[model samples]
Every structure is written in structure tokens, then in C-alpha cells.
Target chain A: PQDLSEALKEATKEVHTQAENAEFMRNFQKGQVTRDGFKLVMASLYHIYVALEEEIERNKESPVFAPVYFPEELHRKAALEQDLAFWYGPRWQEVIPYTPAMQRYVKRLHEVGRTEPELLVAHAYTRYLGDLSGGQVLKKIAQKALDLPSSGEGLAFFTFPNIASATKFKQLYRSRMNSLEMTPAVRQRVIEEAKTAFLLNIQLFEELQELLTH
Target chain B: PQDLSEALKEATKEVHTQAENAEFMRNFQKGQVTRDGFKLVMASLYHIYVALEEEIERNKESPVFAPVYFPEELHRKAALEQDLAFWYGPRWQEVIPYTPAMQRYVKRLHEVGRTEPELLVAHAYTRYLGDLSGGQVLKKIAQKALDLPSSGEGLAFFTFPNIASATKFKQLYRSRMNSLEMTPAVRQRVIEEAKTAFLLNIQLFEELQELLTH
Candidate 1:
């Protein structure tokens, strides 16, 4: 692996495919997501980002994390809040369900943040880069299937207003990620963490699909 | 004082005036700041905001705080990081001094955040509105005094790129703030917290001035 970015993509390719093929994501891709499922997923994202960005702040200064820190460019927590409001009404905070699966995901985020701060970037890359990547397609599907407003109210999660070009920014992000210094062992752990992050997303989607089916 | 924003302004007007009249601020208004002095203040702000925004994220879902959770329009942590990088270099986190005065300010912010989360708005209102208000004047002053680049690199702290119009945003912010329900006692405490927030700024300025002098 010449660069950490390429190495990460190679290592996580299988898990990434697994994530995309999750029942919920498959349904979502087919434009089969109901408002309830979408709302649940958004609520889960709110929790995930609340934890991820919190850790990002905590370690933004670390040399390992500093090169890749891009809150203004990539953060989704605030965007998710507005989306949740659009989906669940004003009292979304009080009413949105935080399920066991979502709790496990949030717990892992904090664990990575607190104890294994070096691995935090893997989680950031997994979620944020994916958002920049396939997430745009999902956004169109969600908006069209849900019949959301053209003004992009509930679809704020998919928007990155600061980035003029996602391709250019992703290239820059990969360059930055490659710049981060880590040992061979730590690099392996980071790759593993990226897989862990994807699995968490997969589990959250699976759980949401099961709940919706039941 | 019919609205919480009006009441808050009325309650903290004296302290706000005192903050402006702080010797550091007065010098700043006169374009008397040096590069080192400006860096120190920016570092202090980095610490203050890391704590403030961390707390804001924590309380964003709360009824008392949710209405004003405009992270896109209001967050300064990332902006401050870039400004600090411009001043202190890329290792700004390791190199930037976190002095006692700044430590005290950070401590109080955490205290307010953890125990008196309801009063967090006072802190947010004090700093953010001021950033939208007189902070712009100080931005020009520091830029001229420090001879910062014309490209707006060192002064990212002063810019609110997401906010299209500070005036309209403040109006909307005030309306949102007024909608937050609080008991009379909590309202009084919030006002006091705003005053406290102002004094903290004043003290930080005084300490920076003293540090620069002797």
C-alpha cells in the first residue's frame, strides 16, 4: 500500500460491499424506504455524528488527526438535526428512538475516540467519505421516494455546501490522510477500525430493516 | 425585556460595555495589536470555543437549547483552528500556549456546560452575537495591525461564511431564543450567566494584555 487511503479502500472493499448490500440499504437503493425507516436511520445518524464529531474535536489537534480534520467540509450532525426536524417534527429529540443497535454503534465511536484516538480517522473516513461518495445517490432516492420538498429540507444530510467539487475535495482528503504518520501496527488497527465502522453501519441498517419488517 | 434576547441585552449591557472597554479591547479598537498578542487571543478563543461548542453539541437536543442549535451558521471551532494554524503553524495544537487565564475561562465554560446547561445560551449569545456584531470591527483592526495576508487566511475566525446576512440571522436567532421556555429563576440565572460570560472575556483580554506587556 503506497498510501493509507488506497490501503484503507483495499482492506475495506469487502466490508464496504457487505454494508452496501445490507437489507436496509438494498431496499433504500430500490426506493423502498418508508418515512419511518428513513426517520429511524436519520435518528441513528444524529447519534453517530454527535459521538464522531465530539471525538473529532477532542483529537483535532493530534498530528495523526490534524491533517484530515474537516468539520466545516464534512460534518453532518447539524445537517442531521434539521433533517430530523423535517421528518419527526419539532419534538424530534424527545420522540426519536435510540435503539440497541444504534447504541452499540455510538458506544464504539466513543470507545475509539477515548481509548484509541489514533483510529478515529478510520471512522471519519468511513462515514464522511461515503457520504461524499454513494450517499449522494441515496439522497436522490430518498428525496424522490419520500416525496420530500424540492427545497432539500429533509435531505440536508447529503449536502456539502462548502465543497465546490466532491471529487477534488476527496482527492485533497486522501492526500491529507496519506500525510498522517502511523506505525505499521497502528495502520493495521486503523484499517480494522474502518472495517468495524462499516460493520456498525451495516448492523444499524439490518436492525432498522428488521424493526420495519416486524 | 419582553423577549429573552431583549432581557438578556438589558441585563448584560453594562458588562458588555465593560468588555469593550477592557484595555486590550480598547487597544485592539485602535489597531495597536501585535502579532504575538493577536496569536494569544486567538489561542484563548480556540480553547474557549472547543469547550463552548462541545457543550453546545451536548445540549443541542435539549428543549432549552434546541431552538438555537445553528451549528452551521454559528460554530467557530473549525474557523479558529485555521486561524491558529496561520498564526502558530500547523502544529498549533502542540505549540499554542494554554495559559492560566485561558484555563480559568475554559474551566468556567465546562462548569456552565455540565451543571447549568440551561444557561449555555447566555454564553452562546454573548460570544456569537458579539462575533456578528463588534467582532467584525476587531477583525479589521487585527488584520491591519498584524499585516495578515489579504487572502483571509489568518482571519478565518472573524468570518461566518454560512451566514448570508448577520443582521437577518440575529433577528431570527433572537426570535428562536425567545421561544425557549424557562422559569423566571432560570431566566434570571441565564442573564447572570451572560454577564459572567462577558466578564470572562474581559479577564481573558486583561490577562493577554498583561502577558504581552510584561
Candidate 2:
């Protein structure tokens, strides 16, 4: 492997493959998911980002989180809130379903936050970078599949308000991850934790698939 | 610490009771949890133990897990399997909803089980001991609350079918852990793993509190 950043990516390739290859993710990508299915994904994403954003805030000063903590560049929790509002109306929180899978997702975030917080770099990479990458493609398909207006009301969740170039920003993230100050042991755990993040995501998608059915 | 055994018991004791945290208690006590709640808890256990016992098997031969490895006495995978069967039936895997909390729970176990089997010892002590100690009392309460079969048809996961007495077996488990003569740093790692174990356990039940849909 190259730098630690490159090694982390290489180790997690299988997990990323599993996540990207999930049936629900493919359906959303292929413009086959419905407004209901899209909304379910939104709710799931909402829980995940809420946990991620909260952990970043909690650990923003921990040096370990400082490098990757870029709330200014990515405001996803609020974006998810707006998207959920569009789906469930103004009283969205009152009606939005927080599934067990999402709770587990957030729980992993919190546990990582509490123990081996340096692993937050892995989570930040897994979530924010993926958002910067595939998330762009997902937004367009979701818009077309859901047939929304051009104002991006229900799609705020996809927008990174401060990011000018996701490609450039991702390069910065990879470099920052490479430079994280930690032992080889911590870094190894981070790699494994990142893979774990992807698997949680895959299972969540599987749940969304079940939800969209019976 | 006098010996690793005593330090472990102390650490496990503190981490074990986190299940009775306000969030979890508020759900099951005072009529907060429905049968729906009970079933979700069962599903969550299945998710953890399936990954846990499987991971334990994968690492049971590793020097770290060797001293504490006692699969025949403590394995709960099939027990959780049977319980899920009772709850969800023949199409159990397809029918049961893997809550986000539970999915993440399972993901963490699988990852730790793979990358650092030594940490599995900590998870091993926290979960198996916690189950052997507290699982019985809680199982009875849950069974009565869910109106489950009194014959223990669905609560198999909570029962250590082979163990004649919890108290005596814990002594034996403690002796085995002492035999490992783990280093101070590794013992410290065990404590952290145990704490993470509680953090994971609490979230599994804590997140379900909202399912009563407050």
C-alpha cells in the first residue's frame, strides 16, 4: 500500500463494494426507487448524519478529529432535516420512522466517538467522502425519480453547501487521513472500523429494501 | 489490581448493569415496551450473538481467545437462532427487521472479531458474563411482559442450557482468564473493550425506546 490513506482504502474495498452493490443503492442509482423508498433512505441517512455530525462536534477539539472535522464544508444533518421536512411536512420529526438499523448506525458512531475516537477519521472518510463522490449521482436520480421541482427543496440532503469541487475536496480529505497522528494500532482499527461502517450501511440498505416491500 | 481476574470482574460488573440505564428501563418498565419491543430485543440479540459466537469461533484458537474460549458452554448463536425462529418463523431471516442499532452492533462484533481477536476476549467477558449474570432475570420479565410461552420456547438465548449453575461457572471462567497472564496494556485494552461492550448494549435498548414512538 502507499500511504496509510491508500492502505485504508485498499483494505475497505470489499466493504465499499458490498455497500455500493446493495440492491436498494442500485435501485436508487437506476431511478427505480419510489418517493416512499427515497424517503426511507432519507430517514436512514438522517439518523446516520445526525450521529456523525454530533460526534464530530463532540470531538472537534480532540486533535484526532480536528483534521477531518469539516462541518463548515459539509452540513448534512440540517440538510437531511430539510429533506425530511419535504417528505413528511413541517412535523417531520414527529412522523419520521427511526428504524433499528439506523439506531445501530448511530450507535456505532457514538461508540467510536467514545472509544478510539481517532476512528472518527475513518467514519468521516466513509460518510463525507462517499457523499462527495457517489452522493452527487444519487441526487440527480432521486430528483428525476421523485419528480421534484428544480429548487432542490427535497434534495437539500444531497447538497454540500460549501464544497466548490468534490474532487478537489476528496483529495484534501485523503491527504488529511494520511497525515492523522496515531499509532499503527489505532490506524489499523480505523481501517477495520471504516469497513464496519460500510457493512452497517449495506445492512441498512437491505432493511430499506424490506421496508419498501411488506 | 491483585490479579487480572479481580480487575476484570470489577470492570465487567460496572459495564454489565448499563442495560438498566434509564432509557432501556423506561421502555420495558412501567409498560413502555410492547411485544413489538420484546421482539426487537430478541432480534438485536440474534444479530449480536450470531456475529459474536461466529467471530469467537474464528478467533477461538488465537492465543488471545484461547484461555477464555469456551464455546460449548457459552455459544448462543443457535439459541438466538431458535428464538428468532419462534418470533419470526421459518422465513425468519427474511421476516425479522434488523434495527439500525442491532445492525451496527453486529458490524462492530464482526470487525473486532476479524482484525483484533484479542479484543474479542473483552467482548467475550462482557456479553457472556453479563448474560449469565443478568440475562435470566430480564428474560423472565420480558417473557411475562410479552406474554411469551412459559415453557421457555422462545427464550432459549437467555438460557445457558448446559451450565448447571451461573455462580460456579463464572468462577471457572474467571480462573481461565487468570491463566492467560495477560500483559498490563492488554488488560487495560480489555477494560476499554468491556466498556465499549456496555456502550453497544445500552444503545441497542436505548434506541428502541423511541419505537414506542414518543
Candidate 3:
């Protein structure tokens, strides 16, 4: 809808700062967080980064302003993000009750202008897009990740509801985008945030890949 | 190592006869007899029917094993049985290739088996054990059917080398045991055939269970 490039640029800058701070807290400020707590934080951040990166990649692949169509390419991104969210969302709620640190972060996220609806829509977008191409890539990545070789239950999350296929979902998504009431700048800001999220993910993955290899 | 009372009984009567017939067809009738061939035939038979059934139930708690261990289980069982003679200090080069029918069956298994290891595993055992804990029941069924889910890759034939953490792997497996292996990314036919194979093994399972439970 709106030109998201500039807002995305700004969001990317903020994400980069937050990511650096997170890394420093994890690496330099060892006692600041337990390894398990830090790992949970890292995992949450990693998923966010991955979700953002995937959105950016999908946006890059699609025609600008053509309305985001969840295609086969975005399947893994969508599925992975949904899974990460599923994992983190519940854990976030659970740990917040016990850990003040996580509680503070959650409060900050809400205060900084995050909303449950945004998260849900973003999640839905990932699921809708990931099911494109019959969710072939989504299924494959899931199988590889889950180690399923024959049955269908493990990959059930990747499957779309029987009422709609990926094509119909795309159309629905386009319609929803048109109906949303937001200023051009706000819409662009949201899109930019999505992109920044993607870039942050790429950076995180790069670091992880390096760590794994090393 | 444990006494497979149910399995031994099931195998001794109707199952043993069917196994003998299957084994005979795979070896003497087809003129492909060899120690390895015999073992492979046995393992594949066990896998096609019992192991997969057990695995599905086990995955109800976690789905990670469906992808990581299921594929490897199929391949490993097939491969090991193909070279069983060799393992016993005999050259298997002299054995004849599988006939078109046998090859077709094995190939079909690989095709269908790759779809959803966890689901198939569950289906097989659910048919036999009635109602039980997904994990314990699966383990029991695996022990009875073919001593599968033995240690790692070697047990399931579909397991992969990529998994780095046993704890994570176990968690993944316990999430869901249904047909997670048949995701769109995997070969659907292989999974389908594996399902077929799972159904076919019910007669054998009943026969074995009767003997052991009695």
C-alpha cells in the first residue's frame, strides 16, 4: 500500500541497535542473564529475525503494491515464523509470570507499540504464504526438521484449512490489506518494521551459522 | 535384549507363515537368496509393518523423530537387510537383483514410507495395542515387531545425521506422532505406499500379538 522503503530503513537501524545490545548482553554481560534465560531470549530474537527476513525476501520477490501473495517461496518463512511464535508466544506468557526480566521486555514491547493483532496477522500471513505450491517446500523443510518419513500428522500445521487453498488465501489477504484503515506513513512503518525484522533475522542466522560451523 | 513374548508368538504362527512366504518370495522364489537379502527382507517387512506403526504413536508427544529418524529407518533397514550376509562375513555380490515385483514393492515402500513416518508408526501400533501411552506403546510395538527404534539411525532407517542434540530430537519426536513425514516437500507416493504397507502388516501383527499375549 504505502512506500515502505524509508520506514523499513529506519526500523532496520533500530533493530540493528537492539540486536547489538542483545548480543552484548548475551556475550559480555554473562551474569546479566542465565545461559538458559539468555538462550530463550536468543531463540525469540532469532525467530523474529527469521520472520522479518522472510517477509523481506517475499516482498522482494513480489511486485511492489501488488498485494502480498503468500507463495511457495514464503512457505518455510511462514511456517518457521509461525512455529517460532507458537513456541515463544506461550513461553513468553509463561515466563513473564515468573521472570521479571522477561516481564520487563514484554512490557517494553507493548509500550514500544507492538500489538497482539499485529503478531496474529503476521503469523497468519506466514501460514497463508507457506501453504502455497501445496506447501511442498514447507512440508519438506518440516519433514527435515521433524524427521517424519511417512505420515502426515507432524506437518499438519503447514496445511491450510479445507475451506481455502493458497490461491484463495492470497485473494483474501489482498482484500484485508485494502480494508485496513491506516495512514500511508503508518502502513509504510508497519511494512518497514516487517522488513527490518527480516534483516535482523538474516544477521542472526549468519551469526548462528558461524557459531555452528566453528 | 528383552523377551519379545508378544512378538515371538505373533511371528511364530500366522505372521511367521506370512513372513516365510514373503521371505521365500523375496529369496528362493525370486532367486535372490543371500544372508543380506534375507535380513533386508526381514527388516523391511518389519519396518513396512511394525516399526512405522510404533513410531507414529511415539510421535504423538513429539514430531521431531518423524523426519529425522523415519527416513533413515527405512533406508537403513533396507540397506542392512540387503547386506546382511556381508555383515555375517559373507560376500553378497553373488546374490541376484530383486525381481521387478519385489523391486516394485521395495521402491513403493520407499516412496510411500517417506511421507509420514510418525503417522504410519502410530497407525500400526494403534491397531495392535488398542489404547496405551504413545511413547511406551510405540517402544513396545517396536520391540515386538522388529526391535526397531533400536538406537539411532540404524533402528528407524529414516533417521538423519543432521540432528545435533538428543534432547531436542526427543522433544521434536514427542510432539506429534501422526503422518508428519508426508509433508508436500517429501515424495508423496513413498508415503502412500508406506501407508499401504502399514495396513498390510496388521494381519501379521495380530498373529504375533496373539502368541505373545497368550
Query: Residue B207: error of model 3 in Å?
Result: 22
Model 1: per-residue Cα lDDT over B89-144, one tens digit each: 64566889989889988898889889989999998998899887876677667656
lDDT of 2 by residue, B75-163 (tens): 77655554565566645777788788888878888888998777888788888887887676676566556754322235556656455
- Candidate 2 clashing pairs, residues 3+ apart or interchain: A100-B99, A100-B100, A100-B101, A101-B99, A101-B100, A102-B100, A103-B101, A104-B100, A104-B101
**i-RMSD values for every candidate model:** 13.8, 24.9, 16.6
Give per-residue CA lDDT, model 1, range A79-190, as digits (tens): 6665675577646777889999999999999998999999999999998999899987987787668764322245556666456678999999999999999899999999
- Estimate candidate 2's alpha-carbon lDDT, on a 0 to 1 scale: 0.75
- Candidate 2 lDDT by residue in tens digits, A26-70: 777778988788788888888898888888888999989787767
Better of 2 and 3 by TM-score: 2
True contacts kept of 1: 0.00
User: Global lDDT for candidate 3?
Assistant: 0.37
lDDT per model vs. reference: 0.83, 0.75, 0.37
Sort by TM-score, best first.
Answer: 1, 2, 3
Ranking by lDDT: 1, 2, 3
Docking class of 2: incorrect
Chain A TM-score from candidate 2: 0.95
Best by TM-score: 1
Q: Cα lDDT for residue B196, model 3?
A: 48
**Model 3 regions lying over 4 Å from their true place:** A1-135, A141-157, A161-163, B1-214
